[PDB]
Subunit: 240 residues, 6 copies
């Protein structure tokens, strides 16, 4: 499931190097000279999170440290790759999210932040949170809880709050907010449940819920819970 995603990635690379020599050595460094996904992702993230304050080479040690202490972060990433390839038809390659998709990079960055937050290294997770915000336009609070098989497609704009929850197999799109409402300190953010699909510009406020296999439509503002397998829409959101 993993080793199988990787094998594919390596294959695509070999063929990609053969037909675009301007990026050959990019493909070779990022993919072809790694043994597994853990390696390629560490390399990729290090470059994506690089700054004057922390160069790639120092970030890589942190990502490797996280992946060593929680190997499942690599499995989650594999599922997030499988996801975007089947769900996005414009994506016709496993390598593509790993190489190029800022939603994917932002997502995996978040997991690093999540691991750091939970260990107690909060100061650094906040630096990383805002790094990803400026680099990739995705502002996920690392205290948030996010599962596997997730897709953030065209991700420019996404925001997700401290107490929020997203569960396996969700698909989000641009400008999607999983926000607060007004006043209620403590818990205050959505609990998006399995297999959901949120559309463009979808604001979704308060400590509510969106149950299984649902559908938020583009433009929607969602103040009221959505039951399993339903479909909400409009401003505010009401079932259709």
């Amino acid at each position: 499931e993993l080793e199988i995603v990787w094998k594919n990635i390596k294959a695509e690379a070999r063929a990609l190097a053969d037909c675009e020599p301007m990026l050959a050595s990019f493909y070779h460094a990022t993919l072809l000279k790694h043994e597994n996904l853990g390696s390629a992702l560490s390399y990729m993230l290090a470059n994506k999170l690089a700054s004057p304050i922390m160069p790639a080479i120092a970030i890589r040690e942190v990502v490797e440290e996280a992946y060593a202490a929680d190997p499942e972060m690599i499995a989650s990433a594999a599922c997030d790759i499988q996801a975007v390839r089947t769900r996005d038809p414009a994506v016709d390659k496993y390598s593509t999210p790993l190489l190029y998709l800022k939603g994917f990079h932002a997502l995996q960055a978040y997991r690093i932040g999540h691991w750091l937050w939970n260990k107690g290294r909060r100061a650094l997770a906040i630096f990383l949170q805002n790094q990803v915000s400026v680099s990739f336009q995705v502002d996920i609070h690392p205290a948030a809880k996010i599962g596997r098989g997730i897709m953030l497609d065209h991700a420019t704009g996404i925001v997700v709050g401290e107490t929020a929850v997203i569960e396996d197999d969700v698909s989000i799109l641009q400008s999607v907010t999983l926000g607060g409402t007004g006043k209620t300190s403590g818990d205050r953010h959505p609990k998006i449940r399995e297999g959901v699909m949120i559309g463009a510009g979808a604001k979704i406020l308060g400590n509510i819920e969106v149950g299984r296999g649902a559908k938020i439509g583009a433009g929607s503002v969602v103040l009221q819970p959505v039951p399993p397998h339903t479909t909400a829409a409009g401003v505010p959101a009401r079932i259709v």
Copy 2:
């Protein structure tokens, strides 16, 4: 029409250098020491698309190669400059889009991607597509088809799909999606027609159409076609 836009640009530059000496040599390098627009644009794009993987100097050869094989990309750009200057009143100078406007830079980048896609160099057009996505927050699939006299104003957020079409003299604004809907592989993206104007946060889904001289209002979600010279609005969109 072209030579006339350029002449203006050069003039503005001379006066800009004279009254802001901190940017004089910027103006001199970007504009004043070029003979024509082709040159200035190649320079400008090279810098805008620069990365560790491909520095300005290597990108410039690709843009020059494209402009040599299709000189009309330069004419399109001239019309996209004329456009933004007359349509945006905050823009009081021809040089401004060329120098500073990320919608303009993103647009011209797309044309390079479009030329590469069509020639068969898909691997590189995808790298460029996502480059522009991270650099400028505009995610235009290069297989899309876009015409001349276009304005992308304040462009932070724009997304446009593989099968989409935009035609001469359109004006788009921030957060505008020309997206898909749900399920229908093959053709699935809007055909925006001549002289249209799309407003802020305008989601527009499916393989529909928006005819001539139309008007999408800010916030609109557009599932249903709009006839020529009409005006849609709201969630969903209905004529007013």
Copy 3:
């Protein structure tokens, strides 16, 4: 009020350095080795606005020049820090906006642009305007007029026009447009008044007004004025 914000910032720093040694010398350079906020902000902005065309060290002289000729820009910034800390609960530290929040950085950048615009150095303010647009996804025209105690939370997407006005103690959020409407050259942009709160994706068009203690809801398009202490919503906006 100021000296008190600073004292806090310095304290947080000392403790932050002690528990995250990877950023110690970052904290030390940005904060701990400054005497006051003016200094720390000059340092911070210089780094944030740095480009090949203008490195940090040359930008810092401009920011210092502005802060010398208008010391109140520092007081405004202090109030914008106090603001975000009390209003955002995820923010539990005074240092955080100064260090990390792109809405805050963008805001203070704008003030520099505003000072330059008003002095007559328009060419440079436009360079800075678009710098901030690409760096931080906030596109505030510098001719706009913005007061103190402002918060731009998760700011990815904000746009604000030439003739616009925002007054003390406002809170804006992502994707918020304070835009024009159609045709009316001269004055054409909102006058947001004291203590207002604008929500996610809130488009707000024309030379209208939003009076005191108001509330624009997420997703709202606002064509019609809002009286003091009201609350608007939906597409278009009508009181509730």
Copy 4:
């Protein structure tokens, strides 16, 4: 001749590049961008100088324009470069490829950079010539005043420490090693620097001082301090140098 070298050299570099790309994948794109995507030496050289001279003050993209202006105005600079490449290939036993100077050797780069600066100097663009001379000094540790007159088929391996003064002459086919100084006594102004004639070999650490001539085909011993003229086809060595 120089113009025939233009093509024999480029031909060879291109071939080398294909084989290099196949055998070293980490550099494949480097070899492609610098060499394989170009159709002549001039285009590769401008590419290479631009990256090598790049700085925050003046980036590659901008330097390339300057370098290409100069090549258009005086394409003998490219033919000289061809001869300089040929010189390194045949004379330095450690260099077995034509590409090596062009890609790697700082002496070769400094040498071609001096050519751009000399062209600028004679066009009256002295402010820029001085900027580039000192850039070259810092980046490659070769210091050549742009008013110096230097010919072709020059080998500057391994160039670290070379200093060449304003009024020095170096003619075709000279080989200079590290730490050569072509300078003044300290006593005069105006014409005060040596005149090195052709085919001269100058050994490491040699200091040649004054407006003195070193005649064709002579050899200067490593470590020498040469204060008097050196006849043609002669070896001078010592501190100060005697004819040996």
Copy 5:
């Protein structure tokens, strides 16, 4: 021995690092990233070489893989480095910390960079060895052909201008100063560079030319041009050098 040095040195560097971090807050994160976050010298060395050899063509992250591959394949390179560090500490009176070579001294960096290039050269990855040799030349002003054979406990302070040819030998415990040339006469090909035996001290500016031997424990005077063999436990000085 080398393997015991691996640990005695690292132990000391770590201690030094804690004290350095406390006393200089502007560098605290530098010391933390380079030294304190690592558990052995090898891991610190790869970190340090990667940053030092980094370029647009090949960034730190990528070089580290190469360096770590080489260390896995031949960990004696790390033990040599340990000895080289020890050498600098005990021999250069201006160096009072083990960390100083590792952090700062370009001679030490060039030396360990040559080791990576030599390993690559003997694996047949010559294109990359040449890229790195010339990188080292530009960044640190030391030029060592990767086919040279160099041992351990080598001090290259203060290394600017050192040139070492393809067929040179430098054995353990040699001390070389600035502007040393280990080169050819100009007359031969093939085996043509000096053989420096152990414990030899070579003074600044010395040129040692030809396939000649300098015997164990000898001393070469600054400024010397050595053309003839130098017996063990002997001092040679002059231009050309005589046994003094």
Copy 6:
């Protein structure tokens, strides 16, 4: 005097800058940012050092604070710099503008960088002084231990290869060329480096070894190895040097 030089020099640099900006548009903003936007030499010098010493570990913006702290604490460093500029202008026949040292010459930059490091060294901030010394070595190829005592009106053209040891003294108005070594014999510790008195001219490649004195107004021949004291107003040349 030094303080009068502060103003006569700056006056001239500003004038030069206006004329340079007008005649070379590619550098106009460079000249504006470095020179025209400043009101005194100190402010320009800190600007220039900060860019020149910048690195990933420590960027311009941060170095400028350090440099400005030092200038506030001891403004004689700026007056020395003024004298050093004046020295280059009058003594190097190739330099015809006051701006040239400040903008371009690495010897001048290394020299002022040593001043910052020396100030740090005497304040007990040695970790940072060593970081900067070795930065200076790599960037400008001048190696000056920060404990060295160096005065003013010093010309270090064209500085590549200069090495100056911990216990060396160089007094006012000394002129040093490339590849000068002010070092030890190898035999002693503690006080072991030369004492160069004022107005001394040291020629290229000279090695001056031991705690020996070179007396005021003497001249050291290029290539020399000086092992014995040199009386005032005397010329020493040779390997080893004799009074000539």
